[PDB]
Amino acid sequence: REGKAQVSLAQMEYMLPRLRGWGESMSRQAGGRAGGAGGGVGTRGPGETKIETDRRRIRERMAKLRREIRDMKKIRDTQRGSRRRSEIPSVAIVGYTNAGKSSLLNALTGAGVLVENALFATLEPTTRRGEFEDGRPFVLTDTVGFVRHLPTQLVEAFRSTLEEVVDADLLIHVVDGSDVNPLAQINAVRTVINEVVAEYDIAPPPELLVVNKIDAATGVGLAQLRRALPDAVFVSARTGDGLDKLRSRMGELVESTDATVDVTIPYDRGDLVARVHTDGHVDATEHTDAGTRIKARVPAPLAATLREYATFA
Amino acid sequence: MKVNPSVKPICDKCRVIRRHGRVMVICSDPRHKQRQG
Amino acid sequence: MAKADKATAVADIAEQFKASTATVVTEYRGLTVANLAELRRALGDSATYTVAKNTLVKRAASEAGIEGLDELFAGPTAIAFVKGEAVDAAKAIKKFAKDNKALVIKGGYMDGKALSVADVEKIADL
Amino acid sequence: AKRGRKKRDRKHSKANHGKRPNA
Amino acid sequence: MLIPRKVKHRKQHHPEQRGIASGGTSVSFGDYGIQALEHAYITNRQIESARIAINRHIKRGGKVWINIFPDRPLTKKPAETRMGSGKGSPEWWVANVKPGRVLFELSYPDEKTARDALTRAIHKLPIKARIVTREE
Amino acid sequence: PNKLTANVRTRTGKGASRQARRDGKVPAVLYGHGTDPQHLELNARDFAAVLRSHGTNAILTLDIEGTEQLALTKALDVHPIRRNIQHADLLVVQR
Amino acid sequence: LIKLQIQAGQANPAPPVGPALGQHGVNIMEFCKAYNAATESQRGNVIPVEITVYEDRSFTFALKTPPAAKLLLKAAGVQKGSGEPHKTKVAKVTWDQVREIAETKKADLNANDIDAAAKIIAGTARSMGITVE
RNA sequence: GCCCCUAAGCGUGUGCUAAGUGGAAAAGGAUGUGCAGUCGCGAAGACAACCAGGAGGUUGGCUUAGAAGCAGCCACCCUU
Numbered sequence: 001r002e003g004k005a006q007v008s009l010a011q012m013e014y015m016l017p018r019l020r021g022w023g024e025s026m027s028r029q030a031g032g033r034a035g036g037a038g039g040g041v042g043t044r045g046p047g048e049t050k051i052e053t054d055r056r057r058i059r060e061r062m063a064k065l066r067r068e069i070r071d072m073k074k075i076r077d078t079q080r081g082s083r084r085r086s087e088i089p090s091v092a093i094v095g096y097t098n099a100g101k102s103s104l105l106n107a108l109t110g111a112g113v114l115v116e117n118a119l120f121a122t123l124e125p126t127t128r129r130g131e132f133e134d135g136r137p138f139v140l141t142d143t144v145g146f147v148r149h150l151p152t153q154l155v156e157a158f159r160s161t162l163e164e165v166v167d168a169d170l171l172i173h174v175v176d177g178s179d180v181n182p183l184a185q186i187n188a189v190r191t192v193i194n195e196v197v198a199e200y201d202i203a204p205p206p207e208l209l210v211v212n213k214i215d216a217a218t219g220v221g222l223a224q225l226r227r228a229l230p231d232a233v234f235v236s237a238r239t240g241d242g243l244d245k246l247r248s249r250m251g252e253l254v255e256s257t258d259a260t261v262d263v264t265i266p267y268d269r270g271d272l273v274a275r276v277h278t279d280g281h282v283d284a285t286e287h288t289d290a291g292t293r294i295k296a297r298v299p300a301p302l303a304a305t306l307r308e309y310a311t312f313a
Numbered sequence: 314m315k316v317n318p319s320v321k322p323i324c325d326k327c328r329v330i331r332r333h334g335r336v337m338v339i340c341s342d343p344r345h346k347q348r349q350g
Numbered sequence: 351m352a353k354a355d356k357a358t359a360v361a362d363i364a365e366q367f368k369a370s371t372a373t374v375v376t377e378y379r380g381l382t383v384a385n386l387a388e389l390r391r392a393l394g395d396s397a398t399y400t401v402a403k404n405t406l407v408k409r410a411a412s413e414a415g416i417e418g419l420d421e422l423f424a425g426p427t428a429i430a431f432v433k434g435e436a437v438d439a440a441k442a443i444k445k446f447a448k449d450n451k452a453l454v455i456k457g458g459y460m461d462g463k464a465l466s467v468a469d470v471e472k473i474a475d476l
Numbered sequence: 477a478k479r480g481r482k483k484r485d486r487k488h489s490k491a492n493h494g495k496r497p498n499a
Numbered sequence: 500m501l502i503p504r505k506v507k508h509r510k511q512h513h514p515e516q517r518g519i520a521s522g523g524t525s526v527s528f529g530d531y532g533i534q535a536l537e538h539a540y541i542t543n544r545q546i547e548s549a550r551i552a553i554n555r556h557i558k559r560g561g562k563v564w565i566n567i568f569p570d571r572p573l574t575k576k577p578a579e580t581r582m583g584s585g586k587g588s589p590e591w592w593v594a595n596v597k598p599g600r601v602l603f604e605l606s607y608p609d610e611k612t613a614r615d616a617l618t619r620a621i622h623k624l625p626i627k628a629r630i631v632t633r634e635e
Numbered sequence: 636p637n638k639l640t641a642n643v644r645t646r647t648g649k650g651a652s653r654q655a656r657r658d659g660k661v662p663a664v665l666y667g668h669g670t671d672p673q674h675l676e677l678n679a680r681d682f683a684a685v686l687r688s689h690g691t692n693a694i695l696t697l698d699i700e701g702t703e704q705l706a707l708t709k710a711l712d713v714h715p716i717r718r719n720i721q722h723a724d725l726l727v728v729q730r
Numbered sequence: 731l732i733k734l735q736i737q738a739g740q741a742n743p744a745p746p747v748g749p750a751l752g753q754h755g756v757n758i759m760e761f762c763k764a765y766n767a768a769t770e771s772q773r774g775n776v777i778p779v780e781i782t783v784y785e786d787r788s789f790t791f792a793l794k795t796p797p798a799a800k801l802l803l804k805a806a807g808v809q810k811g812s813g814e815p816h817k818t819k820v821a822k823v824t825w826d827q828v829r830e831i832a833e834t835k836k837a838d839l840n841a842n843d844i845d846a847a848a849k850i851i852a853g854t855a856r857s858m859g860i861t862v863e
Numbered sequence: 864g865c866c867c868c869u870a871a872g873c874g875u876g877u878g879c880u881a882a883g884u885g886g887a888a889a890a891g892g893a894u895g896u897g898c899a900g901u902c903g904c905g906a907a908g909a910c911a912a913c914c915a916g917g918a919g920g921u922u923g924g925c926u927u928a929g930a931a932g933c934a935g936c937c938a939c940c941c942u943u
């Protein structure tokens with residue numbers, strides 16, 4: 001429904017400036033069984049009739065659609081509660097288009113999102129929980145396709161994506177190794193984050209680079225883009241590959257808010273150390289004996305709970 | 314209390330009951346409790 | 351209950367009592383698996399100490415041939431099929447009246463016959 | 477819509493035998 | 500989506516609803532099926548919807564048959580127009596379904612899941628229909 | 636089990652068949668090797684009962700009003716909505 | 731009745747040994763001290779100790795041979811068990827040594843019946859994935 | 864049409880309805896109620912509940928310091 005409303009609104013509002021002329025020209029002979037431009041759903045189904053037929057109806061429907069998106073904004077922000085209420089680090093797959101964003105998401109998380117051959121395949125930003133090297137049950141979300149000269153007539157669709165990228169910490173920039181000017185691809189797609197931050201200014205989020213299609217790409221490029229070019233890591237293939245350090249540098253560049261100050265855990269209860277073992281990771285489990293002494297990170301509440309028991313080594 | 318013309322036991326513990334001439338589903342989990350209304 | 355179990359219920363007592371010159375019956379309740387095995391399997395040398403349905407075996411007893419002990423089955427029963435040796439069996443059944451005290455001998459079939467209030471102790475007090 | 481529904485359903489009577497003029 | 504390649508006459512009267520089905524009234528391809536009990540115009544859209552329902556329910560198994568093809572075209576006058584000056588353009592392809600006709604048929608090794616998918620299809624359909632089986 | 640009584644048809648036609656089916660007496664016609672059609676009626680209850688187990692094909696001992704006779708089930712005209720046999724067609728067998 | 735399965739080595743390891751002895755009762759050390767004192771001679775064999783506690787406390791020095799599956803492992807010729815029993819079997823452990831070594835261990839556990847012990851050990855081998863002939 | 868308004872039955876006999884249904888309505892939901900069938904069990908003791916066990920292998924194997932049956936995955940047998 002979200003898409004079938006926001007794309008419908010974008011189409012109505014693109015017609016708005018040209019409701020006179022070609023729109024009537026299209027309606028004159030109509031679709032004629034099926035036309036070269038459907039409606040709200042395009043691929044047959046709803047939107048079979050037309051986009052713009054009467055100015056009154058068009059205006060009416062733009063009003064209704066705007067109210068509908070007003071409803072959907074509340075619904076979406078209600079859904080997006082747990083993450084903001086939990087302070088759980090989130091990352092975003094920002095790719096121009098066809099850069100294998102959905103496929104990369106399938107990789108690294110065992111996700112089964114759709115990965116279709118098209119410049120606009122994933123419709124709404126979808127996300128999944130993932131684990132860093134040592135834990136950190138973080139969140140990873142995709143982004144929707146961004147094409148050069150982002151049509152401003154269609155922003156309601158990318159508004160959700162923009163929100164989901166501005167409410168994130170670490171950004172990973174996927175590119176597609178097809179064109180000859182990947183630099184142009186990346187600069188163009190990056191021209192949008194500028195206005196994104198201009199509107200919803202919070203900060204310039206930490207940035208990382210990647211480019212899919214390694215198997216078929218750089219057929220005559222060799223490792224120049226891998227050594228001389230700036231920050232970038234890429235092993236995904238046009239179907240899927242292994243991931244080696246994308247999951248290491250992603251953790252090292254994500255927010256490291258988790259305090260790493262040493263804490264002392266005594267024996268006390270039969271399994272009191274279980275709380276720390278399951279919460280705050282167990283990095284450097286220098287288990288010794290009896291009242292085992294160790295060094296591990298812990299979050300703000302566990303740190304404050306063990307403060308008094310934090311006896312130096 | 315979800316008021317819905319369609320009440321069906323959502324989980325294995327949900328039990329239907331007729332009360333005051335009005336179908337109601339009651340479950341150990343409070344979230345599943347609902348009534349036809 | 352189950353038809354096959356009922357059908358076997360004849361042989362479930364027939365040859366057992368034909369071989370056993372003695373058997374015991376009493377209201378058993380409380381001894382765990384371990385306590386029961388302490389004499390059923392832990393001390394299994396000359397008697398099979400088992401249990402069986404007390405309601406389905408009432409007809410099976412008549413079928414097997416025993417008739418003296420039929421009114422005493424109204425309740426839990428812990429049978430002890432001995433192959434004849436009684437001097438140790440009587441001691442075995444009398445031993446449990448110090449540690450548990452939950453195991454008495456309400457009655458049973460002695461030598462193809464019933465018994466009295468004192469026979470439970472006089473079977474073999476030697 | 478209530479008035480139309482009622483005037484129409486008035487045809488289902490034992491006296492009209494099911495059909496009413498201008499149903 | 501289901502649609503005839505071509506039709507001789509493009510503007511036909513509405514398909515009739517009277518009477519019962521004298522043909523197609525038995526499961527003859529699969530094991531289970533949906534027998535309708537009320538006249539209706541099942542449309543290409545509903546047929547596609549129910550088909551997707553059954554296929555999504557049954558995981559990569561079983562075979563599905565459709566004993567009805569939408570071929571009768573139903574017209575529609577363009578909005579905000581008076582009455583007269585010719586019939587409308589073809590709008591919806593409908594298959595005239597009658598009482599007793601078996602619309603969908605399924606063959607799946609399991610039993611409960613086949614029944615459940617059939618129920619899904621019935622809910623997606625407009626008419627009242629029951630689940631009939633090859634047995635009797 | 637396979638022994639099904641029968642009763643010749645007193646009347647015949649639309650009204651007779653409707654009345655019989657309302658009272659629960661499936662009509663049937665018996666013909667074949669003997670080449671002498673007989674219009675009769677059976678108790679739909681037992682007819683369907685035997686059909687459930689013995690299947691459509693079955694050698695039915697039709698106990699006619701006056702004697703017995705073997706028969707075979709040839710046709711079963713059944714209403715598609717009301718799953719009930721509307722008419723039966725029995726093939727006589729000479730053995 | 732708290733059972734801790736361990737070998738005759740080691741002394742007060744918390745992750746495996748943080749029991750009610752250290753939780754509430756005698757000091758943590760004494761438990762393993764008195765447990766290993768009377769059974770040092772184990773040499774890798776698992777000799778689990780089952781301690782009892784009375785209304786206040788009552789230590790018990792108890793022991794038992796290694797698990798049935800672990801004995802099967804010892805004799806079979808592998809150190810790590812298979813996580814896919816009946817999908818990738820490792821070794822076809824025979825029955826002669828099984829009998830000769832279980833002719834008393836099962837007599838202690840349940841009973842000395844050789845056939846019952848054979849069925850139990852077959853079940854344990856099936857569980858581990860290193861089945862028998 | 865026959866309780867009074869209102870001429871004439873608070874008619875007789877079987878049942879049914881708890882909804883003021885009668886005295887508006889759909890998809891669909893539904894342990895409401897009458898009747899006719901069927902499949903298990905059960906006077907050798909079932910269905911509810913009550914008194915004891917519900918064990919040994921054994922922290923069954925993968926995982927994990929960990930997973931004892933209970934995040935999760937394979938096996939899922941027997942001794943009495």
Ligand SMILES: Nc1nc2c(ncn2[C@@H]2O[C@H](COP(=O)(O)OP(=O)(O)CP(=O)(O)O)[C@@H](O)[C@H]2O)c(=O)[nH]1
Binds near residue numbers: 103121237
């Ligand atoms: N470069 C790359 N392409 C892939 C990979 N896996 C699949 N593909 C192919 O790329 C095609 C496009 O899918 P994908 O690039 O994942 O879509 P997307 O870029 O994530 C989202 P959009 O298509 O809207 O831009 C698919 O048809 C698929 O066959 C991969 O790991 N890397």
